[PDB]
Structure formats: structure tokens, C-alpha cells
Amino acid sequence: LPTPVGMEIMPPQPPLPPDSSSQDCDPTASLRPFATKAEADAAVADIRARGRLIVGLDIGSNLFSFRDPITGEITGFDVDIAGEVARDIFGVPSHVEYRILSAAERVTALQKSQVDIVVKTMSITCERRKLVNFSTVYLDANQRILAPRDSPITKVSDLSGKRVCVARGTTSLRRIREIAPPPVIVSVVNWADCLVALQQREIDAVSTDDTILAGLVEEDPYLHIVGPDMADQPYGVGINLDNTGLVRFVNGTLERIRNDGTWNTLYRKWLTVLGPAPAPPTPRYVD
């Protein structure tokens, strides 16, 4: 039976203070799109000259960026968001090259200019905004708990003393580190590994974005999502800190798809297992 490479039982730590998830920089405010098409096209001239948009994500995140088992094609909500950016740059969604990244590599890939954008369920936080830039919010998720249907776990305090799996490099870890008494924290490279670990009964529960958890439930209907909202997860397109022009450009793409029906279509395609489509997230601008 398979075993995820890189599984670590983390050293026990005292709980973090409850306000460790505070987000007081107003992190979700971003830059207004360009007023003219000429300004927008100039901001992406270097991408156009390279002939493709280079997008950081992975191919193992069900519903968001994965390989379709019927068609063999790379697909999902995040893949489609990235393709809409490419459509605005090139005229059609199909000039994209992917760089495969883990959750723990999203910031460094941007710092090192190894991708143009990261579209990989990337929560916008004050801490991350010191290192990278972000578009406006394109999907608002919330952290919850995934457990087998025969588990009595239904609330956060039930995680105390139990084995909870988290992918390294995620906001999900910080929130689990606030639980008192602590769970046993087991960390892995990606959320698909947590699913394997739960299937093999090496852990008791997984806690992350309900969107990501829904993709795991789709693969294993013996599991269900429980508990209250544990932490807001506002997704943004990650961009190099200094490429403010690309921030404005991507924010133009998001204005387009929020208002022309495409956002609604993408939610209905990928996320209806969580319920009826909400209104698209309202963008917030600093300027």
C-alpha cells in the first residue's frame, strides 16, 4: 500500500496565542486595474514576448489543479482562473506553461521570478504580503475539518490529542497550532498525502480550506466535512512583490470574469458540492 514521501510527526509545541490568525494589514486590498487597454498590454509585454504565461501550481489538487482521469488533461478551478489571465494576454486561454510547485514553494517561486503568477489556492495574508504581491480575492474559502463518517469528531476541541494532518507551507498549520491542548501534528508535502494517510489510518483528521477538503471528499465519500469556520482563506493570484503592473492586469481579468458570468460558471463547474454559488467575491482596492 502506498506511503506518502515526507511524512513528519512534528515536535510538540505550546499552543500559539489565539490572535495569531489576526489579519490587520487589510491584506485583501489590491491595485486598481489599468484604465486603458494600451496600458494593460504594455504591462504584460514581456510575457507576450516569451510566448506563454508561466503559472505555478501542481497537478494533484482535486477540483483546483489536477489531471482529469477521463481526458488526461490538466484542469480545475485554479487552472481555469490562470487560463483566463492568459486569454487576456494572448487572446485565447491556451498559451500557458506550468511550473509544478508545492504549497511550501509558492512564495519562493515568486521571489525568484520562476513563474509569472501562482494560482494555487493561495490565501492572502499580511505575512505573505511582506514577501509577494496579490490580486484581489478570486475565491473565499474557510478552514474546516475532514474526518471519516464513523469518527465522533465534530468540533475543534475534538482535535486535541488526536492526529491531524497538514501540508507544510500552509496557513492551515498556524490555525492548528492555536488549538489547546494541541493535536498531534503530522505534516506532509501535499493535501493528497493527508488523504492517503487517513485512508491508511495513520492520522485521525485533516484540517484545511473547505474547498480543498471538498476535493478530498469527492475522492473518498466515506469522509465528510465537519466543524465551524475556523479561519478565513481569501485566495489571491500570487505575483512578484515588485510587478505591480501584473497585479493591475490580473485584477482586470478578475473584473472581467466576475461580471461576464465566467466566475459563476467556474464555481458551478467545480464547487457545487459545497452549495449554491455565492456572488463572486467583491474586490477591494487600495487606490
Ligand X SMILES: N[C@@H](CC(=O)O)C(=O)O
Q: Is the peptide bond before 276 cis (omega within 30 degrees of 0)?
A: no
In the complex, the smallest distance separating the C-beta of residue 142 from ligand X, rounded to whole angstroms, is 10
Q: What residues are designated binding site?
A: 106, 121, 123, 128, 171, 191, 209
CA dist., res. 284 & res. 86, Å (int): 23
Tell me how far, at minimum, the Cβ of 162 lies from ligand X, in Å: 20
* C-beta closer to ligand X: residue 89 or 197: 197
CB of 151 to ligand X, least distance (A): 22
CB nearer ligand X, residue 212 or residue 257:
212
DSSP letter at 216? H
Which H or E run contains 254?
A: helix 244-259
Find residue 99's DSSP bridge partners.
Answer: 56
When the beta carbons of 62 and 233 are compared against ligand X, the nearer one is 233
Residues in binding site for L-glutamate? 106, 121, 123, 128, 171, 191, 209
What does the binding site for ligand X look like in residue numbers (CB under 6 A)?
103, 121-123, 167, 170-172, 208-209, 212, 233
Residue 254: C-alpha distances to residues 51, 165, 211, 281 (Å) = 22, 33, 19, 10
The three cell numbers of residue 201 are 489510518
Q: How far is the CB of 235 from ligand X (least distance, A)?
A: 7
Which CB, 86 or 176, lies closer to ligand X?
Answer: 176
| Contacts of residue 30, Cβ cutoff 8 Å, sequence gap at least 6 | 133, 134, 135, 136, 236, 247, 251, 283, 284, 285, 286
